[PDB]
Symmetry: C3
Amino acid sequence: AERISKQSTPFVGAQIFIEPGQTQEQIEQWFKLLAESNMTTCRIRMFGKYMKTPSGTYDFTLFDRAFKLADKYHIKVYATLFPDTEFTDVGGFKFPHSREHQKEVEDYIKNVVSHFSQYKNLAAWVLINEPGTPNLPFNEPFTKERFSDWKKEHNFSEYNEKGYPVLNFEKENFIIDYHNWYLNWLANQVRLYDKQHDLHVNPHNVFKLSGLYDFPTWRTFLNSLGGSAHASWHFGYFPRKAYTVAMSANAELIRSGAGELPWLMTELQGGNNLYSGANPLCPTAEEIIQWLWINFATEAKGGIFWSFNARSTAAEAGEWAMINFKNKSSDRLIAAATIGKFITENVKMMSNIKTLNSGISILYNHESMWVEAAQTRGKLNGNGRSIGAVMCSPLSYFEALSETGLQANFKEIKEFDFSLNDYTDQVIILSHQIALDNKVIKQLESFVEKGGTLIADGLTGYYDYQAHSTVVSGFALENLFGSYPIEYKIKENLFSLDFEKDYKLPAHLWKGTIETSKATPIMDKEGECIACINQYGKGKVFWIPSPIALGARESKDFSELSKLTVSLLPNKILNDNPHFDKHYKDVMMKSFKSNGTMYSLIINKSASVQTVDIVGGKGKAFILFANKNAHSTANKLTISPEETVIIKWKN
Amino acid sequence: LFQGPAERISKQSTPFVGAQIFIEPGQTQEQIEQWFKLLAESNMTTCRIRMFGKYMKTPGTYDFTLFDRAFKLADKYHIKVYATLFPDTEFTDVGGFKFPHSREHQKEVEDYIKNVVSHFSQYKNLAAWVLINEPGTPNLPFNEPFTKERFSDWKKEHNFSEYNEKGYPVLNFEKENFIIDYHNWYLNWLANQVRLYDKQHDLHVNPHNVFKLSGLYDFPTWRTFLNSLGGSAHASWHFGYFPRKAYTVAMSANAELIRSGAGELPWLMTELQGGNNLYSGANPLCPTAEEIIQWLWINFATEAKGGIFWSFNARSTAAEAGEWAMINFKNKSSDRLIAAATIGKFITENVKMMSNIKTLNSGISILYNHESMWVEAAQTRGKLNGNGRSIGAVMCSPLSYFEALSETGLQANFKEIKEFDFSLNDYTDQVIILSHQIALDNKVIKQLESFVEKGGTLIADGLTGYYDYQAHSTVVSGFALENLFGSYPIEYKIKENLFSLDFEKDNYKLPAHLWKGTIETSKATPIMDKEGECIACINQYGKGKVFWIPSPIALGARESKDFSELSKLTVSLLPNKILNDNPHFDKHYKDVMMKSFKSNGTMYSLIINKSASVQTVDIVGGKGKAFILFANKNAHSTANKLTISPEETVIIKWK
Amino acid sequence: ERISKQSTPFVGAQIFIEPGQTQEQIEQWFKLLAESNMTTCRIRMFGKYMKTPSGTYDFTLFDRAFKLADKYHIKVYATLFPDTEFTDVGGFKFPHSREHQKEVEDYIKNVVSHFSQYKNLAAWVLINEPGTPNLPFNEPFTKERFSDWKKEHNFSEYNEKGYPVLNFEKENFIIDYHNWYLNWLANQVRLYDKQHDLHVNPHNVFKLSGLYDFPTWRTFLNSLGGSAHASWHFGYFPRKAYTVAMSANAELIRSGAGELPWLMTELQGGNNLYSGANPLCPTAEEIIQWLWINFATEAKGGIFWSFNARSTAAEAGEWAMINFKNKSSDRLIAAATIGKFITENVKMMSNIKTLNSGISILYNHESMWVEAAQTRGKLNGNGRSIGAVMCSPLSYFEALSETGLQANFKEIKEFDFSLNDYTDQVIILSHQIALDNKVIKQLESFVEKGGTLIADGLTGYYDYQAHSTVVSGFALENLFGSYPIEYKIKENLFSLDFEKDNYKLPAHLWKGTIETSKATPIMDKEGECIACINQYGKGKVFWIPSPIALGARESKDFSELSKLTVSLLPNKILNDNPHFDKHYKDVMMKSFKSNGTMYSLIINKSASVQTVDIVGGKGKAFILFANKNAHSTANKLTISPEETVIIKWKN
Ligand SMILES: *[C@H]1[C@H]([NH3+])[C@H](CO)[C@@H](O)[C@H](O)[C@@H]1O
Ligand SMILES: *[C@H]1[C@H]([NH3+])[C@H](CO)[C@@H](O)[C@H](O)[C@@H]1O
Ligand SMILES: *[C@H]1[C@H]([NH3+])[C@H](CO)[C@@H](O)[C@H](O)[C@@H]1O
Ligand SMILES: [Cl-]
Ligand SMILES: [Cl-]
Ligand SMILES: [Cl-]
């Protein structure tokens, strides 16, 4: 069996939806067109329901038929373990209902892995479709008992070391461990019967569910990390014109979770929402090209569209499909096929992509999300006093950097390597990460001391991991920030921070004021201290405790956040990295390397032709890919609305 | 002419204006008599009385005194009585329970019916038993043991497979099919209970909120045990899909829907809004005098044998205290009772005309089906965002065609598909509109094929035929309507709530809602858009034609608040016979309606102006010269050009 | 000291005591509290922070605070707060069970026996914020109480005339239950301490007044308190009208107090981060506005929640008057100027008596209870929603404030109907939809003896059993000399245009038409009778059954309601009371006396400097207090935006 690696040739693929009632002739027609569309790979939901016989035997006929047709057309198969469940359960159950249900899942895995492991075109086992749920079944006896046991095996005090009352977030910490346990158990079950094939899983809705996911632990039992990134389900924090930024951030978040493992996008939106989806659309041909290039530029080893063909009955009947109702190519399949073709014509380049890390890392942590949920009491008013602000804030910095043509990592804090001796020319952005503990503050102190630049806005560091505010009891970040908070004063959803001898930064909801000791104060036109720069060892801290990233989001203008961030970056980042000479609204660029050669991905999401002046790095623009005849004069790229451009930098 | 001295309602009965007389303890003889006196002097012949079990129960005997007093005063003033069976229930239960709570409760209802029917059947002024007030509820009591057991029994008596004949997974809509049968069962049982003690009087029932609850109602089965079909059509409860200026269209569609359900049975509007919402109602108003006249004429023009207003007098305590009443707090006439009285007077002065009304059927039938509503509910997961991806699109779509036709002065039927007669040999000059009827089975497609083959015109827009009755999409597995449509769907692509379909020829633009459908023609003639995609087709099929446009253009007209393009398109697809034989407008008129009817050979037209300004409407088609028989604001006509004032109702007699 | 109507008013603040705080921080709070001219603190006596493992009480944490309060001559309001979940911010309102009642008995024994011994104990607060909309009917203690209460009451389903009735068993039980538990808490405290003032702080009074029988509470209290938080309680008002909100809240508590002194136990001292329904940070200007409105309305104190902040989870670092360095915000500096003013004007400030104009705006429990039943709990902010029966009188109150006229705001049972003369007294019953025969007789007596009655909206539509006499035989026909004909629903906003071409009154939702017998009809331009004046004995009735107060609210314009009301007032009120020569949008004035000397409080909440012409009473304006250099020429006051002015009337 071929094992996926960081050197694998990336593929374009699609879900092949198999259910009873389909004919041999239609299934073969799908695989034939899939092969002719320069797609190498399919994914198949191995429905327990469509293998169970009245007598309790497994009948594999329906899936044998699909596997054999895949083999005939040289299509490899991601096989999703999907035990028997209600027809109306679109996504699948996330945990066993009971010990008896766990034994049924054991029996399902034994039967399905023993049989289908024998196919030479099996590429991977997907352990579970879309692990993680917002609504965890605490009512079910399996989960209820696990939670009880877990609580008794942990020693939690109602008071901290200094004697203050604490929250311990038992539920949230259990949920991490519970996901870790069940996925690890699924991996172990598959490994009883098959030690040959890649294990894969697709975390989903990552801007909401990242607080469920311990990706470092998952690396211990996976061969690749996947992802669902559906424009109609997962990008609600963005307008459609910014699904570029959404896909880029989703790619960076999975990339970070993957660490040393290769990653691929297991599930992308391939077609139309009729009745399904939260933010329904039909992806344009242009969007299909944009999403594949963003993922490959971000080291994805694959892009699998849900779906090639449609479900026939009830939920998503005739929805999501890349083929039309005559089983011929939509403009979406035609577009995906040009990327498959491009890969086969540029194998060495496409097989060795490494994202050009600017040195900027935007960090989020589970605990800021958990404290936000407790403090907002689950309010959904889309603002700082609602669930989502601790993710929308870093996503806004990410967007501002994208509109500057700068790559940024998007990482959980435990995925950042704090063990290096030098962080010269490395930048951490902590945007409204409202919960930081002593351990992480010490890591941040080390990082800055050794040359790191730390940018902190919003209520970053207001609470610890027990929702205790050191801002009240004795500020844990006083040392690093060389300053102390004075007040937060709530304002409108959108106000202006007007710096002395003007920046006018858009700010959201709260004005923070500080007192500097070691730091240099920055004053506003009202004579209040609203920010500071602390020189700490070899590094610097910029602290502005008003939410200026959420301000940029609220004002729908990232230009001031771009200019401010650029002015704080070490010169080395601006000299070594291709970026825009200025901020461009609704334009993104990210750069990658493949065997020594540097490339740039440019996408224009504005309503008009843009001329983007690319500066930094070395080389002359050669246009390798452009779906609307983009042209460059020196390093000035003229790019049409919705166009995707790959520049190869020659020399 | 054997089972009763009781007058039995017929399609030949003289229509009446009437009102609820609300009877509760605490009222005096003097006030009740004053109500019946004024009711009689307002040219009303009929009242309806809720026979509250609560106000007859003694510390277990029945005391009938409170209702005897009302029946005797009704009799004294020659007022006939619709008596509503309303068993004992909480004072706070405004509308009444819809089903027994338990086997023990069913026995209490049996005892209630025995006592009340045995006693009040003896009054010579009893016109009808209303079996239940407003059968049907959105929120069915599945948690109560009587319903839970009935559902369990019904499930064990039905054999459902999880797969169809081709092997595909299916939904079976057990809940929805049970609910139809459960309503059928309980109403039939109520009819049987009444018939144990009285075989002389008309059985009546008033289905309500029909644009939402039609999926609960099997009117063909109800005909089996009713003598007349009723209806509640309240401007404050039932017309949420319409602005107030289109309550004319709402009432006309509600009348057509009940008319269709009635079939051979006479029908009447059991419950119309007679007065003011204080705290009650979803879309509160006080009907204008003009609105009262509009609603009575729309119903009579649509073959109603009665209009009964809720209410003559008001409830006194809590819910709807001093609300809904046609009389003011001094028990004298509001402008609403004075207006209703002019229609009562008109009827007594034109008995033969008013007793024999038959709606002039244009030949256009707008069809809805239970199953499109049920599949919509499952697919939209009960979303209430008032659009294609919400509950109500499958009804708002046909209602939009209906509105477009009303603004063209054309009658259209509004019928459940099982109420349409598919058994005829000729459908020349007949038109079916299937607007966003997303669920169609093989049986109905065969009926539609027969209909078109024999000369029928089929107009289909939106996602009509996307699913079958098991929510299986033949669009995915093998399109069941390919033969009839002479074409095949290619894609739906979601767009904004309002977009334009830009036709390749003639620079022609249709408002469309939410989804753009593209097709491939085989036998049909393709119609292309400016982007070179096929968006519609005309299939010639035997003697008939099919127009198919799988974008929602009716919902597009609704979203744009403009039915003028939908009017022009529909008119251009009608057989010439419909335009030549039927009075209609020479063009589309925004916020004007006309419907025509016949009575013993003579043709009439009803015209209502709901616009802000005086309109001159050019009436064309049929034969005759306009004579203005009824006009509440001095309408005048020159030849067949009618000048009609805002909120005016006009009846033209064609000489 | 025992509090009296002659006590010197104080400024004070909550001192929030929890484990983890140091001696040094607590002392620093009391030191700054003393230096801020604050004499009083309030301390939550958390049962949780006195319970030891063994069930003994350890008082150490509160001893430390009491002793530091004593050292700085700070008196203490001690709040009885039994053991409860850390997450319970406001405290439980009733015992959970008979066993929990015994724990509360033991808590009171231990805490009152111990802390009664401190010489700086000013008051026991029996319970923090009595009243909850949602009573725990599920819990056995409340379930049994309701069962017992129901068996002790005989309710008939019909009235005397035979009509069906509602009896509001739940609402009547809830009044009696609050009466019972507070009385029981008072009796428990009195078992161990007969020396100290008993106090309680009713809250959210514009919503919870239907829970509160203040006349009964007088029997076991020495003072009535109040929570009046801008972020929780003033939802019916924009921020620019929090002056009117505080004035109405002060009047409502003052009325409940009767002969008892009252003080505002809980005012907003600082910032909402995540807490509050209508979040803000009070301005310095707002702090001064609220203290003066309360003192002008006879308050013996203003206690801010809070001096210092909670440290963990709910309201962590929120509400505090001190900043995170434990120094003065502009809010503490502002509060300190009022403390200083009091020490420099002891005799004036100790003897304040509100100058009663003679205008009383009456609300009743029963209008609120019938509204809840008729609106079925709808929250659409209009006549068909919960809150109209309170927003309506609050709108008259606002119109009178913008005329510079004091008005009482009273529950109908708090109005003295037993006098022989009501010459030059005015009652406004605005949309008080429920009136019984007893109250109609009191209103007949009041008008007969010279009273002026103003009734708008659906006043008197129902009786106390939600039976409408408008339908069965109008109970107010005699007093009104007229009969309702119809209500007709209209738009949210329409105009009642009087035929005499004077008044064009904004009206909300319903147009009422009437038939006059004894009364003089007032016709509108459409030829309908919309109002009347009835001469009844020596008094007059103005009846307009359209909601013109809710009309003024909906139009955000109280000017026509002001002019109409002024034209109906007895001459004596206009001659004897300082008021404005005309209506001033977003300006308030209320007047008070201290011994013989008359004063006026003027606040400008408009965006611009106003010149207000004060007329009525006697004297020349001398500016005693002004925080933005107000000046007067004769009796014309020039007052800046957000400025508070006290005028002393010299002669
Ligand atoms: C992912 C995605 N959610 C599809 C479209 O909603 C769904 O049908 C499948 O269950 C995939 O897991
Ligand atoms: C019909 C209608 N719902 C009336 C107004 O709400 C009501 O009083 C009656 O109970 C009928 O339900
Ligand atoms: C009063 C007020 N509700 C405070 C602020 O929300 C709260 O912390 C206190 O518990 C008091 O209830
Ligand atoms: Cl899958
Ligand atoms: Cl009835
Ligand atoms: Cl307290």
